[PDB]
Amino acid sequence: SKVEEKKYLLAIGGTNVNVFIASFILSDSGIEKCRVVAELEGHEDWVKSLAFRHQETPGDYLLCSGSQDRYIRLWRIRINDLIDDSEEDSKKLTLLSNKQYKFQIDDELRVGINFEALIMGHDDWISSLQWHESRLQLLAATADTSLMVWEPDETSGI
Amino acid sequence: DAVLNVLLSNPEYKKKYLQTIITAYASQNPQNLSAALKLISELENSEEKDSCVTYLCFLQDVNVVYKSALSLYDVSLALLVAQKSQMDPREYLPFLQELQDNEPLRRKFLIDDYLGNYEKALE
Amino acid sequence: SGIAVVAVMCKPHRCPHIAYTGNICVYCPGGPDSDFEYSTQSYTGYEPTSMRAIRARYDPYEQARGRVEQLKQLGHSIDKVEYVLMGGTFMSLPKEYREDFIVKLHNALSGFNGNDIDEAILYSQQSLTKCVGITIETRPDYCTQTHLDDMLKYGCTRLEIGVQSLYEDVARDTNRGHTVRSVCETFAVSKDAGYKVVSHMMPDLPNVGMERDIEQFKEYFENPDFRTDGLKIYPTLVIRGTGLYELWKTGRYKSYSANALVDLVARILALVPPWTRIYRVQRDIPMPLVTSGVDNGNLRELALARMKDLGTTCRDVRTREVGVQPDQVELIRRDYYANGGWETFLSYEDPKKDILIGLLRLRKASKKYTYRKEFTSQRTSIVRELHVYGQHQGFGTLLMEEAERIAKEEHGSEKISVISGVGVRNYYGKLGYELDGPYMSKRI
């Protein structure tokens, strides 16, 4: 997907237990500064499907990362001047699993990627992932002839 | 003791062979875990606190290491031991947060009621 | 833990020796030209593996996936699985069916979706539910240089040949279709390619009497032609629609009583050398189907009890492991000559309690054989399997430390080469090895 003018982010996945995210800046002729900057751990088996959600809030959107350990781990990508500053002397016992990845693309666009949610179930491997055009649901298809919609309900959060 | 008698004297013996010091304490019948977990906290150069605690929690049960890391009054060390302990993070992490913001002498009473050191708590 | 054994069956087909002989084997039951409904060759359709195949309609992606996750609903917690193929003459099938069969065997573990045989095994190398080997059974006239390197591309490491007799008249009169001097020549090209060769033997065949059975198996381990790494003892069962059923009908073939047969296999296991294993003493056929032959389904323990009061202990490498703690262990090796090459058998043993810890096979590559391109530019030595049971951890790296020191000095080799399976290719990459085709080798 894109962020705000020309800067893109690509999300690589396959054959291992991690998720790779790269970045590159566009130009009049081609692209440049194409390098791998993140390395997302958390999974237990291969990553079969992953997709971006559309940027509803300007500067804040989500990321689904489905995998072959029957889990559908989510991510969350924020923008400049909204980084959720941390690691200060009044630290919050950051629970190193939520270690809040951070990088720069060139110099003037820097992001923060943290962990959001984690869902069990699905009874088998999951195949395909889909978001919605407007609302905040998520479709998942598995390998045991099942198809279920996931939704964040109120008064619970999860 | 005799192994520790030589490679706790030179400054360069505890550089290369710092990992076998962890086994030399933790293999005793008094089970001197409090001196192994003391020299880990002084390791300031790199991430070698991670590589040593993952070796100390293999040859010993992890909650035995967790209760001993909790006893020498430094709470940032007890955090790294608990994440290796297959425990529910909603239990220990809130307990570790209440211990962080208090005063130091306020902490050393709160830390001893958990363990059973009632006389040491009372001081 | 352990190793998960998932058994699949290929498409029900006809053997390829029905054309020029006129029919299949005399004792073989089942198949398409029989009365059992929709059954693979040498099966009846009433077996617990052969009932999972018919419900799956022999679809390899759905037959294997239903078997794997069944074994973890019981809760075996599988992460190392070894496939074995059975039924028919799998290498007699057409070439565009065999390669697509093996591809979907790998896709049931990795999750890759494709049809290229050269690319599916690369995805399967970094799998986490990993394959340590594929066993494919075949006939001795289907182990030529065209067929042996097709199995290397498939990921096969162990292959099984039905020998079933060491006499020339028995392989002729039972319409077997080959000669016994031909199977002792194809053992040599198979063991020099790096395969664990297992053969099948059948007592109580027609025209081989009681006394000829015991000099049949004494020759099998004394002669350096055969001396294989495994056996499956399959006593002859008379089935309903077979060829030997009419010999039972007209009174021209009768079987053994079940007191002399258990006496026989109590003597066969006494001669088993410590480098071979006995996988089966009988096969899984439900006894309502069988008319004559073996009465019950407990011939294994009745044979171990019959040699209790003879003083003789079966020194079998399937029997002599942990299944009793060692507290100590020694390093011994054994050296025998098998069909063209110098085999050695390294192991860790206890001579008192008679229990094994680990084992290893190694072979000097001969000069009359070994057509492979990687094993011709210099003198090489081939390690054939490593198999460690279960500190009790460093037994793998000790057997690889010793098999390499013995190859440079005593063999005089410039390269050592492993026939590791696809899922365990990464265990050898840490030890300094590099892949070159089917093999995981290293210049010495």
Ligand SMILES: C[C@H]1O[C@@H](n2cnc3c(N)ncnc32)[C@H](O)[C@@H]1O
């Ligand atoms: C395919 C495998 O089945 C075995 N086999 C074939 N027919 C019989 C029988 N009647 N009894 C026992 N084993 C048999 C063969 O020996 C071969 O190894």
Ligand code: SF4
């Ligand atoms: S024995 Fe092997 S070959 Fe002879 S018929 Fe039965 S299966 Fe076909």
